[PDB]
Amino acid sequence: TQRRSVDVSSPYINLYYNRRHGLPNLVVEPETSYTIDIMPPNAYRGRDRVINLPSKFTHLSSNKVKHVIPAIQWTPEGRRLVVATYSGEFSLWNASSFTFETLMQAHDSAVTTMKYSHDSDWMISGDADGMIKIWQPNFSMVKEIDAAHTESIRDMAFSSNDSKFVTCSDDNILKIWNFSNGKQERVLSGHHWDVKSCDWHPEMGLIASASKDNLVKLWDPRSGNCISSILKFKHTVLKTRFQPTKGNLLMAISKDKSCRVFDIRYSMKELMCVRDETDYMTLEWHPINESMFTLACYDGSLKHFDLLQNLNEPILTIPYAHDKCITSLSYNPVGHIFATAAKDRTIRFWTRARPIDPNAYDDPTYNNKKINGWFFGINNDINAVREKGAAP
Amino acid sequence: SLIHPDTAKYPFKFEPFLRQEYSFSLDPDRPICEFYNSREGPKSCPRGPLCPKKHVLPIFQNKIVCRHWLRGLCKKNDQCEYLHEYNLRKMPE
Amino acid sequence: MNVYDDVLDATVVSHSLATHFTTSDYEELLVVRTNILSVYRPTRDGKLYLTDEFKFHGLITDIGLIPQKDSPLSCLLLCTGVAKISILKFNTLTNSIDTLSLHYYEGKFKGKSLVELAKISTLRMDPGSSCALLFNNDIIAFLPFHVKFTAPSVVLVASELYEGAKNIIDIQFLKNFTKPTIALLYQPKLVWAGNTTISKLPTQYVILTLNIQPAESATKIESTTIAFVKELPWDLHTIVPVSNGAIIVGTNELAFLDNTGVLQSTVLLNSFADKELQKTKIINNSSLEIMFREKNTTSIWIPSSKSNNDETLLLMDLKSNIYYIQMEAEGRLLIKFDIFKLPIVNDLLKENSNPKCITRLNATNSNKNMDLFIGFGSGNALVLRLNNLKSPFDIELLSSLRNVGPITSLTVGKVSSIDDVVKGLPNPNKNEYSLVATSGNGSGSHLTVIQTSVQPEIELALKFISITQIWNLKIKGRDRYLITTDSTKSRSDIYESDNNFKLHKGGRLRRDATTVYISMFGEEKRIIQVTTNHLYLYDTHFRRLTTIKFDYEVIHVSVMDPYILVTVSRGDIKIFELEEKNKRKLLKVDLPEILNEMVITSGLILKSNMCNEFLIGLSKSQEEQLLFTFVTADNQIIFFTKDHNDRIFQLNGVDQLNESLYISTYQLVPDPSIKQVMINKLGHDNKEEYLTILTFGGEIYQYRKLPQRRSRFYRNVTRNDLAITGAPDNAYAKGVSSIERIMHYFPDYNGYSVIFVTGSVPYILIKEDDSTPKIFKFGNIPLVSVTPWSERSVMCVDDIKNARVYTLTTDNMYYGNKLPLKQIKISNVLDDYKTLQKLVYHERAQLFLVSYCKRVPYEALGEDGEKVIGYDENVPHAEGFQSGILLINPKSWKVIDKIDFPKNSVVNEMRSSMIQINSKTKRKREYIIAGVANATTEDTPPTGAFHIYDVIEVVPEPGKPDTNYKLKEIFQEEVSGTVSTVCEVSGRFMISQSQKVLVRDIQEDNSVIPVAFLDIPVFVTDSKSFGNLLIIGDAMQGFQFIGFDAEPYRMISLGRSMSKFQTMSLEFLVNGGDMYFAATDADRNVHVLKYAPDEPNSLSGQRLVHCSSFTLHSTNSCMMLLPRNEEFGVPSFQNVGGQVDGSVFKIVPLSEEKYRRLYVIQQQIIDRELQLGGLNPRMERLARPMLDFNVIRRFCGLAIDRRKSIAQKAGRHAHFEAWRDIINIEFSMRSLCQGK
Amino acid sequence: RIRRTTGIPKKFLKSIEMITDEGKFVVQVEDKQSWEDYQRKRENRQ
RNA sequence: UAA
Ligand SMILES: [Zn+2]
Ligand SMILES: [Zn+2]
């Protein structure tokens, strides 16, 4: 059987041939033969970061049982995508071919969050009943914390060395856990009402928490006391993330229809304040290129941004990216595949644009012309570019 | 030989550790232990974990290659009842 | 515990400038390779004569020139690392470079940057010499210059100069502006090939006049928008300012924008140009398919010569095609804007690619004739002469700078010593191995033999019976009377060399005593022989004419044309002069009175003009006077003339071996260290006067006489160009214990004026015209006596009474770069194999295997045979790959076998591994395993293949005896996933597939089956094995440590690097009982990590301990494990790594005590000595440290008392042991001198 | 509302005597051996 | 002998 494969092995061969021979990465021309000159996403910095924009709809996956997908997570090497379902199940999907079906039944309630360790040796998952499960990379549950939180776990983030990890729930507190023994270390007290998301700084000890009380707080993991508060959100603050690599920035979205990026190095200096007519629901920093992130909205409409290109509008909008509200985004660690999950019970994979493409920025994901099965020819096509978007 | 330096039998300080953990050594083709029995356990060998011979784990006495191990998704690890060795003739088709 | 050394210095020329840096008598050519700033004097015929070389501790990112008031010389702006400026001036008094000021900008750049900085900052200099700007990514660092030398610097984002500047592409200073006006090319919305259809004309261009207001504290700058252009093609990347405007070079267009700021015209270069999109001005459509696909296009803008309307601009793409661009403007308006490709009839530029810099050597007030120096990333840097720049053009090659291009592969094999017998006698460099590297990137791509020693051509070999020294006499310009002596038996033979060295048996020569010295005398009319206790004068026919009896036995005797100098055991000097009328007199010469009351260890008669200033009526830059030079027991070099009156001169500072020496009157603790000195001319075509000092410890010190101010000798201490051959304080006594080291000068070896140093390990001093003198190991056998032979030859006698005549091989040899380099042209006029890579040596068959890589146009095919939809056939295509294997016989360096791999195939790894073909009998065979990866697009499934080749002896084809071997493929297999690496573990080979590594074994019946299996995170970049321990590099997640087992085949994950980096190469740094790994980064960092299971926070060794980080000055292409030579002291190993800039490095592991001593010495040197560009060597390598042997080499170059003081910092005996381990590091590569 | 033991390899399930595989109900238990090995490997030189 |  012949199918659409996205492997970065040959681009890495070309890139390392160029680097070992002192040859520069030649400019790609708008022609198909120049796709061989497109380097892996990790090789592009500066003005070449525009190449690492996921804009071409590549595949559409779905489980046998159409279940709500609260969270998706790539494996730390990007080999597989872990798709948590509302039925507390883990479905893996190979990045090479977007093909797998066998389930796992991870939890008993809806898995609300997953997070792999920076060392790539440990995955923690939380569910709707407050239980926290610690998983080996082969998905062998090794440790349960039955009552980590009274309410449903909302977000969990590992420390820089993965010795600790912070969790948040519908309760108004965050608690730091010692991973080695699975014992709770301290409670981050504050955050009236409800805390919705948390994140650990990639390099140093710093905790950012988003809460229903219109607040984003910065915590000291060593002491457990809030060190600064952000008052710039006029309603409950949804998912917040620092950055994958450096952490100099911090982004938080709120359901008041505003996304804000703060410079943590300059007293939470506001950098970007972008507002949308529709509600943002989740965000995802680019794993390789700083200043680049994607916002997912309630009407679909993936919105890719760039701090250095535009501080007011997205550099690229995919308006009909999903048929319903997008719940989770997940960039591949290699950076060549972007996975999105929505309430339409579908996983949609996005790859980088091709040098020439007749259907580029004209897919049913860009024009609302989704007729019956519009992805049958975009998911069963062995090649990528395809003749000029529709399907039987 | 400068082209192929003899790096096989090198005295390493962690070699006893490699014997204790992973049951490993620096001689891949070392003779099998005449006293060790996989089912009896490590106590069957008088020399203990620090034996120059090979102490084969019971995981490698299994007959059929674990299909989940080949995908890197074996939940049983060394306790699996199927072979965790890339043996081609022992694969289940 | 490691030390880093540079086996080879960089050869790729990255920058070049023409200026008055060290002198104003002529325009010099400043050449930067990676960290060495070379000053050249370009002759009228294009030859480059090196004036002096300076080595810096950082990567020279950029260079620039700024004038200084009250001086004709110009200061130098040196850019190193990331965002650092050091202002350099040349001190004429000290003949060195002193740093005016340091300017650090990396901290401010990081402070003002949201994203990571670019690795390389870019420097731009105002043509008005009012300011310089350094920018990294939209952050501009301005360095104002006062018209107290440098005003305070201001750093700001590009958005502060102009509101719209968001993604800077290029910045340049515009010309013909009364204020420092800059031009910014930027794309507010980033656009690439896949973004063009939804984003039209994104590039913008703004012209800003800067009003810099320097103040005491800070600098205030205000920019006024002179002009702004909004709609420009997306592919514009380079601004090339001209007299009336600026040429904007793009991948597909050449836009001309005047200083007024209107896009007057543009030229479409290929089919990919923005056809029917600009549509607003003159559109010059060209079907030339010119492609400027590089980030920055190299070019030279030659101003109009006063105006003759001869302002010329020359672009140059990556394929080394020179393009002429004419701007026939009559004023503001432009007429006849076009690009013309310069015709190259003789394809002299074929061997070169990726030009880096262009500099005009000689102006001659006319742009019609131009001498251009161009540095290339792959070929030799060239000095070209362009004759008639027309829209009959002729281009000729004047000279070239040797460039080993990008060393993309490194291996050890036998280039010499294949045959154990040369002309009857054993091979002089027998059982000697050499580093062989792959050089070049395109049509010009070769094998570079990095010879550990000079291989001399033998044209005569004979066996003697018993001698200790020989002399060859040339009477009528021909070889006669080769006198031999035997010190042990007190004998002297004549051996007339006219006819097969037959015994002459004629003449009354003293046959019955040891001859100390014998040479022609009296203008070749007399023969003088100095015996143990007697001095004899003969004539051409060996008839005795004069005899002198010496009470004490003579030791040192030197002869000039009218004079002879004799020293006896009593320590007093005896100088005799031949009578001019009829010779046969040998009158005495009156010595100075003060001479007889002081001890002299050695003496010689010397001809030089160094002390002409102090002589009466001789202050002329000519007329080398005769000087009687003597070395005193206090290591003082004194000399005087024949008419000396009573005045004795002296080289000041030579007793302590100071950096600078000068002549002065000698006015008057016996510690004899200086053994022999001589002052003579060294070089190939232009001869430079050098003072060479031989110490009793075997170390050789070289001083360069300044051509101007000739009474002073200077030694470059920053440059680590002179190899270490011995140690002062009797350390390394075995280097001089067996055979006494004598320095012999030969003005004509093969046109080279060289110095021969005898001993158990001989040395030769060769100086190329474009390089400093270098100490080269000569052969691999001891040298006892060397004498001139015929013309341009010498005869050398080893320790086993074997005499053979030598000649310097100069056909493809470059005797510079710290080690002799041999260029091996594999591609000939018939078969033009492209860039060669993955070179291996088959030890059993003694053959070299290399893989060629032809760049063919790439056709994107789907999984089915049908082509991918968006294909255009009448358009230039991107280059694919096509590779094969070449079997090369080192006997003739000819390809004796070739096999070709299909389209879209690159051999990503080749090894000459020893494979166990039987687990029971343990039989091993050396197979060649090639890993072929199908270089294709991301959309197609990855595929690859691995081939196992056995070299088999076959019947040679008649005519060619070296074609007695062929490649037999014992196994091949096409596998899913690219094969990026190949490695052998414990007799079995492991290859990498897509996110997978498979270990296979070969049986006797040539059956290959996988036995092991391990998953890979992203992509395998390199893989090495140490017995049964693997290290697998990853393109994103550092590397991991794997142990391999057999019976129950296992791939045990022993550990992995805690930090995720894109590793380039891997190697093992064993360092005794422990185990360390060397990992080169894509950021030019080499990391040392250790397997420490016993450390607390290692998770039983699963977390590799990060020991040190070391920023190399160029990206590493390859690493190899080499046995380490131990001069004094379980096998030990070292790492040898090839760099893209053409440099070879090595990491030598050290023990704890050696590391402590060398770390203390290095820290002392850094803290106390003055660094060249003000760069701290510790901080430059940190962008327990790895020790830089370049810094430790400065310890060897310090003064004697300074050396003792530095060594005293930690260790009573630290001087002795420090010299011992410095010798051990310096000679660590001499394991190649002893093998099999 | 009641789950099935899909990916659980029948050895980390004990009969409770909320999730069932074939008839009789079971419950998932942590593999308190891999976690212990992780603890053992966290020890110094072990 | 399986999840
Ligand atoms: Zn045993
Ligand atoms: Zn298993």
Q: What is the 3-state secondary structure (H, E, C) of chain A?
A: CCCCCCCCHHHHHHHHHHHHCCCCCCCCCCCHHHHHHCCCHHHCCHHHHHHHCEEEEEEEECCCCCCCCCEEEECCCCCEEEEECCCCCEEEEECCCCCCCCCCCCCCCCEEEEEECCCCCCEEEEECCCCEEEECCCCCEEEEECCCCCCCEEEEEECCCCCEEEEEECCCCEEEEECCCCEEEEEECCCCCCEEEEEECCCCCCEEEEECCCCEEEECCCCCCEEEEECCCCCCEEEEECCCCCCCEEEEEECCCEEEEEEHHHCCEEEEEEECCCCEEEEEECCCCCCEEEEEECCEEEEEEECCCECCCCCEEECCCCCCCEEEEEECCCCCEEEEEECCCCEEEEEECCCCCCCCCCCCCCCCCCCCCCCHHHHCCCCCCCCCCCCC
Q: What's the burial of A121, exposed, middle or buried (CB within 10 Å: 0-12/13-18/19+)?
A: middle
- Distance of alpha carbon C240 from alpha carbon C327, whole angstroms: 13
CATH (domain of C1134): 2.130.10.10
Please give, rounded to a whole number of angstroms, the shortest distance from the CA of A137 to a CA of chain B. 8
Are C908 and C997 found together in one domain? yes
Q: Residue B49 Cα, ligand 1 centroid: separation in angstroms? A: 7
Domains with residue ranges and CATH for chain A: 9-379 (2.130.10.10)
Tell me if C1198 is assigned to some domain: no
Residues of A with CB below 8 A from B84's CB?
Answer: none
Which amino acid is located at C705 in the chain?
Answer: K
Taking CB atoms and an 8 Å cutoff, what residues of chain C touch B72?
Answer: 1015
Is D42 an 8 Å CB contact of chain C? Answer: yes
Residue B76 CB lies within 7 Å of the nucleic strand E: yes
Chain D closest-CA separation from residue A88 CA (Å):
8
**Please, what is the angle between helix C1200-1207 and helix C1152-1168, to 10°?**
120
Q: For C1094, which residue in chain D has the nearest alpha carbon?
A: D45
Residue C969 inside a domain? The answer is: yes
Give the method used: cryo-EM
**Cα-to-centroid distance, B50 and ligand 1 (Å):** 8
Contacting C with CB below 8 Å, chain B residues are 1-14, 17-18, 21-22, 24-29, 32, 54, 56-57, 60, 70, 72, 85-88
Question: Domain boundary at C1093, C1119, C1149, which?
Answer: C1149
> Quick one: C610 and C682 in the same domain?
yes
Residue C295 domain flag:
no
Kindly list the distances between the CA atom of residue C553 and the CA atoms of C550, C563, C672, in Å, as whole numbers in the listed order: 7, 20, 20
Question: Is C871 an interface residue toward A (CB < 8 Å)?
Answer: yes
Residue C1072 and residue C1057 share a domain: yes
The helix (run of H) or strand (run of E) holding residue C786 is strand C785-788
Could you tell me where the beta strands, DSSP code E, fall in C452-543? 457-463, 469-474, 479-486, 491-493, 515-521, 526-531, 534-539
Tokens of C253: 């267009």
Give CA separation, B20 vs B15, B40, B52, C169, in Å.
Answer: 9, 17, 11, 58
Asked if residue C452 is part of any domain, the answer here is no
C969 and C834 together in one domain: yes
CA of B76 from ligand 2 middle (Å) equals 6
CB < 8 Å to B54, chain C: 1047-1048
Q: Which residue bears the tokens 């052969």?
A: C779
Task: Fill in the amino acid letter for C440.
Answer: G
Residue position matching structure tokens 């003159």: C282
> Is the CB of D12 less than 8 angstroms away from the CB of B75?
yes
Residue among B36, B54, B56, B57 nearest B46 (CA): B36
* A2 chain-C contacts, CB cut-off 8 A: 863-864
Distance C1099 CA to ligand 1 centre (A): 26
Can you give the resolution of this entry in Å?
2.7
Query: Is C1067 among the domain residues?
Result: yes
Q: Are residues C956 and C1051 in the same domain?
A: no
Cα dist from B40 to B18, B43, B44, B56, whole Å: 21, 7, 6, 12
* Residue B68 Cβ under 7 A from any strand E atom: yes
For C142-209, the DSSP string reads: EEEB----BPPPEEEEHHHHSTT--SEEEEEEPSS-SS-EEEEEE-SS---GGGGGG--S-EEEEEEE
Name all domains of chain B by residue range, CATH numbers in brackets: 12-56 (no CATH), 58-93 (4.10.1000.10)
Q: Is A354 on the interface with C (CB under 8 A)?
A: yes
| B61 vs B83: CA distance, rounded Å | 7
Determine the distance separating the centroid of ligand 2 and the alpha carbon of B84, expressed in angstroms.
Answer: 6
Nearest CA in chain C to A11: C938
Q: Is the CB of B75 under 7 A from strand E?
A: yes
Query: Smallest CA–C1' separation from B74: which nucleotide?
Result: E3
Pairing relationship of beta strands C1187-1188 and C2-6 according to DSSP bridges: parallel
In the numeric block, the tokens 């017995």 are attached to C1027
Token pair 């010798």 in the structure block, residue: C1223
Closest CA in chain B for residue D9:
B75
Q: Please provide the distance, in angstroms rounded to a whole number, between the alpha carbons at the two ends of chain A.
A: 20
**Of C964, C993, C1015, which residue is a domain's last?**
C1015
Handedness of CA C798, C800, C804, C807 (dihedral sign): negative
Nucleotide closest to residue B76 (CA–C1'): E3
User: Are the beta carbons of C1112 and C379 closer than 8 angstroms?
Assistant: no
CB-based contact (8 Å) between D1 and chain C? no
Name the neighbours of A, counting chains with at least 3 Cβ pairs within 8 A.
B, C, D
Per DSSP, B60 falls in state G
Chain A nearest C-alpha distance from D35 (Å): 5
Distance CA C22, CA C704 (A): 15
C599 shares its domain with C700: yes
- Closest alpha carbon to C1' of E1, residue: B81
Neighbours of C278 (CB within 10 A): 19
Q: What is the C-alpha to C-alpha distance for residues C454 and C462, in angstroms, rounded to an integer?
A: 21
Residues C1063 and C993 in one domain: no
- Regarding whether C698 and C832 lie in a shared domain, the answer is no
Residue C715 structural domain: 590-743
- Neighbouring chains of B at 3+ CB pairs within 8 Å? A, C, D
Residue C605 lies in a domain: yes
Cβ-nearest to C938 among A2, A271, A336: A336
Chain D residues with beta carbon closer than 8 angstroms to that of C1099: 41-42
CA atoms within 13 A on the CB side of C78: 34
- What are the tokens at A17? 């041939």
Residues of chain D in contact with residue B67, where contact means CB-CB under 8 angstroms, are none
Please state, as a whole number, how many other Cβ atoms lie within 10 Å of the Cβ of residue D18. Answer: 10
Q: Are A288 and A43 spatial neighbours (Cβ–Cβ below 8 Å)? A: no
C735 and C611 housed in the same domain? yes
Domain count, chain C: 3
Distance of C1152 CA from E1 C1′ (whole Å): 55
Interface test with B, best of A81, A138, A141, A142 (most B CBs within 10 A): A138
CA atoms within 13 A on the CB side of A30: 21
Q: Which helix (H) or strand (E) holds C605?
A: strand C600-608
Give yes or no: residues C735 and C835 share one domain. Answer: no
Determine, yes or no, domain membership for C578.
Answer: no
Nearest CA in chain C to A354: C194
Distances, alpha carbon C1045 to alpha carbons C427, C927, C1048, in Å: 44, 21, 7
Quick check: A140 and B72 CB within 8 A? no
C883 alpha carbon, distance to own chain's centre: 29
Same domain, C837 and C709: no
Q: How many CB atoms lie within 10 A of CB C144?
A: 22
Can you give the distance from the CA of residue A329 to the C1' of nucleotide E3 in angstroms? 29
Compute, in angstroms, the gap from residue C1025 CA to the centroid of ligand 2.
Answer: 28
For the beta carbon of residue A344, count every other beta carbon within 10 angstroms: 17
Does a structural domain hold residue C585?
no
Pairwise CA distance, residues C847 & C415, whole Å:
10
Q: Residue B36, CB, less than 7 Å from strand E?
A: no
DSSP character for C303?
Answer: P
Tell whether B75 is within 8 A of chain D (Cβ): yes
Tokens describing residue A188: 């981050």
Q: Which of residues 64-93 of B touch A (CB under 8 A)?
A: 72-77
Out of C743, C778, C798, a domain closes at C743
CB pairs C-D closer than 8 Å: 12
Cα A224 to the center of its chain, rounded Å: 27
Burial of C19 (0-12, 13-18, 19+ CB in 10 A): buried
**What distance in Å separates residue C1102's CA from the closest CA in chain D?**
9
CB C706 within 8 A of CB C726: no
Angle at C263 between CA C258 and CA C269, to 5 degrees: 110
Work out the minimum CA distance from D34 to partner chain B, whole angstroms. 9
Q: Give the closest-approach CA distance of D24 to chain A in angstroms.
A: 17
Out of B21, B26, B56, closest to residue C1028 by CB = B26
C966 in the same domain as C1035:
no
- Measured from the CB, is B65 under 7 Å from any atom of strand E? yes
Nucleotides of E under 7 A from a protein CB: 1-3
- Mapping DSSP onto H, E and C, the string for C700-729 reads EEEEEECCCCCCEEECCCCCCCCCCCCCCC
